[PDB]
């Protein structure tokens, strides 16, 4: 594409610079270019891809929520008519958000997931697939919402099955996947009991395996465990 003439290594180098400068749209474009070179991504490179898109879509989501709240208020009794502008602008932001999600899902489908054989890479990519279908689900209102939800669920479930068979219960990828799938259950699938059960079981099984870890691994795992606990506290 636009990055077709730049070396893969230069793309990675500039993604790292963009991260330092908090230029996440540029970071995402550089990492998209790197993926489109066709080679598999290292662990570090996967992390750069995920950070860039997480920050781009995270800003979009926050803006969409602001605009949706204004639009909801505009449709309450006693609200004065202000015309089509709030809906139009929410729609603009939504369409941009959907386009970013479609871009990431496209990279995963062409061809990151099919070439990912090791458990750690495959689980990482399937978690991303679940996440970006989840973001699509957050804004979905039509005859495809059910199918979008099912696409998220299916990706997360495949990732969960792999992680349980192939990774220890303290593995950060495994833990982060569970955290996010539990949020899926609570916020998207209208399954708060499933969300709570998953968070609890994940936390407890990780706790029992902490004794096997180095100091630095212990720090990583306990940080994510605290996020599970924070959600449990919010929900109970």
């Amino acid at each position: 594409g636009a990055m077709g003439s730049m070396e893969r290594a230069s793309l990675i180098q500039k993604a790292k610079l963009a991260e330092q400068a908090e230029r996440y749209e540029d970071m995402a474009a550089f990492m998209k270019g790197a993926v489109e070179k066709g080679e598999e991504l290292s662990c570090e490179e996967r992390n750069l891809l995920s950070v860039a898109y997480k920050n781009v879509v995270g800003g979009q989501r926050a803006a969409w929520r602001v605009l949706s709240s204004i639009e909801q208020k505009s449709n309450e009794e006693g609200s004065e008519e202000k015309g089509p502008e709030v809906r139009e602008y929410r729609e603009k932001v939504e369409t941009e958000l959907q386009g970013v999600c479609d871009t990431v899902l496209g990279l995963l489908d062409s061809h990151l997931i099919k070439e990912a054989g090791d458990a750690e890479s495959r689980v990482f990519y399937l978690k991303m697939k679940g996440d970006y279908y989840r973001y699509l689900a957050e804004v979905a209102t039509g005859d495809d919402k059910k199918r979008i939800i099912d696409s998220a669920r299916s990706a997360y479930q495949e990732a969960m099955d792999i992680s349980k068979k192939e990774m220890p219960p303290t593995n950060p990828i495994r833990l982060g996947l569970a955290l996010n799938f539990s949020v899926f259950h609570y916020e998207i699938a209208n399954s708060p009991e499933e969300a709570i059960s998953l968070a609890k079981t994940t936390f407890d099984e990780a706790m029992a395996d902490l004794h096997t870890l180095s100091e630095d691994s212990y720090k990583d795992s306990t940080l994510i465990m605290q996020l599970l606990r924070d959600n449990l506290t919010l929900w109970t």
């Binding site: 955290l179 996010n180 949020v183 959600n231």
Partner: peptide, 5 residues
């Protein structure tokens, strides 16, 4: 909003 990573 709940925590995700």
């Amino acid at each position: 909003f709940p925590a995700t990573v």
